[PDB]
Design a protein around this nucleic acid. Structure first.
Lengths: 105, 191, 122, 58, 52
RNA sequence: CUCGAUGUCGGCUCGUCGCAUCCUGGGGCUGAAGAAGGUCCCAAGGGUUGGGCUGUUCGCCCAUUAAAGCGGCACGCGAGCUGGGUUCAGAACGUCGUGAGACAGUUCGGUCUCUAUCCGCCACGGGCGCAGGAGGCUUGAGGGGGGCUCUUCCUAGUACGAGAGGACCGGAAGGGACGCACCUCUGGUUUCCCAGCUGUCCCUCCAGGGGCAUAAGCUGGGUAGCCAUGUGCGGAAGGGAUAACCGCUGAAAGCAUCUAAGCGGGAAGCCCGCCCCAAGAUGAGGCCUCCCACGGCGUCAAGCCGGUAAGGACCCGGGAAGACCACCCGGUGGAUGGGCCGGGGGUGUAAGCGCCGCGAGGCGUUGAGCCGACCGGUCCCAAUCGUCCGAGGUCUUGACC
């Protein structure tokens, strides 16, 4: 619900900033598509597009940064602008097989 | 292979004269593997490889006419099933799973004044005092969704090839589209 | 549809107004009064003593139900209302006259009588 | 509120027997991509960074 | 007609028709016609085949 | 037996027997023509409804119906509710008692406790087995499921009949409760898919948004899956052995007798048949399709090693497959996830500029915009690379080449 989002939110956020973070299996598996999806919008690129992407992310700097910045570095492909890579270790007490994901580059 | 069978197309109704809903079914001739006979001794299934290309990735009418198509080379187009007929199909339940004695098995639950009481779903009882421990009687949360389901009076209406496929009279194939359907018109009554 | 004590008006004039639904007529089990069907209910109230009178043991049938009736013609029909007509053991109305339309039905399960009296049968 | 509780000393025997079906099974791991060594079947590591791309450190 | 009036519309080469008392009527359509119309004054109706 | 304690009425649910059988079939009987009843013998399959008033069962009453059965199992069920009630202290009346208290007379209200070990039941995995090692396919002994019914029509208003009525026999159709399955049509869903909204904080002022207002703040609506109110369908034929019950052929009783022996008739019933398992039925079954004799060690070394991708696995990626597990399909010579892309479905024409009115707004561009799983393309992404384990072919007898 409000939480599913939130996530996708900040994760989508942080990420674009670095372009490959460290969350567990799933977490990543999703932040992908979405974030992913989002991308495809930076690609659309315009009034609208932006008015969305931001709509969620909320933040000029980026929002723009990507739409212009990265977007391009991608204008060509077909989704997938992300390469979700699992990881070797696992957060303690837990034992969760975290994992890392980036913007396929 | 004694019979005839394939998978679930899907359902939809439409037309007729009053109108009527059926279901689509996919299956040309899934080849012919040996044939049933217990002659001179025990005989049942042979295998003179002639199958697909992958299959080794895992490597008296009904059956009779077979001999017709199973010796032809293997396959055997389906459809004697013709215009207005009653085969029977045996779908595969439906991964519905382990549920409460509720739907699993008709039963009235937590009434009113207690039909909520953060109360609810859960059978009434087992066995009396003196009788004796338990019966193999009262079902239980007897999982479902996997059962080798099927039925009867399975009337087929029509068929056409473009792709060997069949139109059905009332679907309820049991399992889901893209599912494993086998048909027959067993001891028909409407005959 | 329409049993225990669901209520339904008149369209004929029998001298009624509305009627409570006792039993669904037919045979044991059975749980439903759908136009064409015949109900075992009574007066919830009836004009100023036309000929019937409030609280009168009764027999009426099905002709108006917002329960929606699926016509063998894969079609669909329903109404803004739920009520029917009284009857004389002999599936025979009393109301001399009709009211809101109805549905082929009736015919199919006997009643013409009203079938035509009706202002309009849909 | 102990409606139901054991009723007869569980029997070491059994008891353990119980605790019997249990057991582990070493990580299915493999061996380095070029990292040379044993890694978590499918991953780089404090030995790798590779796979096909240098996405790590050391 | 025009879903009686509800110029919108809904449900296949069949559809369906509600209905009221007095030999009056209400052929029908969508959940945007219904409710609304079923509760006030047609005239005033807009969106559709009325306030067209 | 139990007071080192077996928690007691009615209800609820879940039922399970039994037959003296209420409904249901089969019979013989009648003061039975018909029809409908009465009588009694045979059969439990299946089944035997909503309310009312009563804490009640019981019971009377209301509308049904074929029918609306009698009774078991602590008058089944509290480690499953109920908890009204009789049966804690209150307190009431009435009632006895100098009184104190009191009552199978009554009246208000009055704490039914989370963790199943065993046996037991329902379910799903793990072994070990079935003596080559191998994947695919079948048999079912034996079990389990299910069997009811009303009504309408011809036969026929013909048998019967003074008449008002109403057949066996033979055949159509509909419908009732019930169960299996299933979304097409129908209806309920639709936690964000889409849209309108009032209050507020950030947002940069406007616009265009954003959380919160549960966990969606509120309202309209809404695929796909699930799911009924809804879709198909089912309870049959027919075969064999009988009840009761009806007969034939004929003794002993040179005359009769269904009779011991001989042969047939006859049931919703048994057996079979129709679906649903199912050889872990240690009697481990059948069959087809693969794999060939490797190493060195003292022996009936049937013991330790490379193997044979025959083959399987594990790890990954995925499933109306799913608690875990096991089970199914795929693992870049891939379309398995996601992604994108067309397609459908769904929300009702967007953000902007435009043109009318002081404004509110409207009209346009514009059936726009936005789209959660539904149908299908394309190697953008991510299923890389890798391991492990696995056969060899036990003893006797004979039948054939």
């Amino acid at each position: 619900s409000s939480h599913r989002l939130a996530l996708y939110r900040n994760q989508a956020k942080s990420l674009l900033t670095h372009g490959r973070i460290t969350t567990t299996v799933p977490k990543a598996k999703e932040l992908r598509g979405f974030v992913d999806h989002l991308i495809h919008l930076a690609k659309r690129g315009d009034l609208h597009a932006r008015r969305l992407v931001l709509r969620d992310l909320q933040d000029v700097k980026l929002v723009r940064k990507l739409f212009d910045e990265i977007a391009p570095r991608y204008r060509d492909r077909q989704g997938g602008y992300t390469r979700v890579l699992k990881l070797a270790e696992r957060r303690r007490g837990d034992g969760a097989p975290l994992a890392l994901v980036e913007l396929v580059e | 292979v004694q019979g005839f069978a394939g998978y679930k197309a899907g359902m939809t109704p439409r037309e007729g004269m009053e109108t009527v809903p059926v279901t689509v079914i996919e299956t040309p001739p899934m080849r012919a593997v040996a044939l049933r006979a217990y002659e001179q001794r025990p005989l049942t299934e042979v295998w003179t490889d002639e199958f697909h290309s992958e299959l080794d990735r895992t490597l008296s009418d009904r059956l009779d006419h077979a001999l017709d198509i199973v010796e032809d080379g293997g396959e055997h187009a389906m459809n004697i099933f013709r215009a207005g007929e009653y085969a029977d199909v045996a779908g595969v339940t439906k991964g519905k799973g382990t549920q409460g004695p509720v739907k699993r098995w008709g039963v009235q639950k937590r009434k009113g004044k207690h039909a909520r009481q953060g109360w609810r779903r859960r059978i009434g009882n087992l066995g009396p005092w003196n009788p004796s421990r338990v019966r193999s009687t009262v079902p239980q949360q007897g999982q479902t969704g996997y059962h080798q389901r099927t039925e009867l009076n399975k009337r087929l209406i029509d068929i056409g090839e473009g792709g060997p496929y069949t139109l059905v009279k009332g679907s309820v194939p049991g399992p889901d589209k893209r599912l494993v359907p086998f048909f027959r018109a067993v001891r028909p009554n409407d005959q | 549809m329409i049993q225990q004590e669901s209520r339904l008006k008149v369209a004929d004039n029998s001298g009624a107004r509305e009627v409570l639904v006792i039993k669904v007529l037919g045979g044991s089990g059975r749980r439903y009064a759908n136009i064409g069907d015949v109900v075992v209910a009574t007066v919830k109230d009836a004009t100023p003593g036309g000929v019937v009178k409030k609280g009168q043991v009764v027999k009426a049938v099905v002709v108006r139900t917002k329960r929606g009736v699926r016509r063998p013609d894969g079609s669909y029909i329903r109404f803004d209302e739920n009520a029917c007509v009284i009857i004389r053991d002999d599936k025979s109305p009393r109301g001399t006259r009709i009211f809101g339309p109805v549905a082929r039905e009736l015919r199919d399960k006997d009643f013409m009588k009203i079938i035509s009296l009706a202002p309009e049968v849909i | 509120a102990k409606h139901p509780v054991p009723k007869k000393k569980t029997s070491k025997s059994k008891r353990d027997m119980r605790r019997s079906h249990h057991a582990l099974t070493a990580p299915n791991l493999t061996e380095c991509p070029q990292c040379h060594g044993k890694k978590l079947s499918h991953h780089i590591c404090p030995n790798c960074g590779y796979y096909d791309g240098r996405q790590v450190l050391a | 007609r025009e879903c009686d009036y509800c110029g919108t519309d809904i449900e296949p080469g069949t559809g369906t028709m509600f209905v009221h008392k007095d030999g009056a009527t209400t052929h029908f359509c969508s959940s945007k016609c219904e409710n609304n119309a079923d509760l006030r004054e047609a005239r005033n109706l807009e969106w559709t085949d009325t306030a067209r």
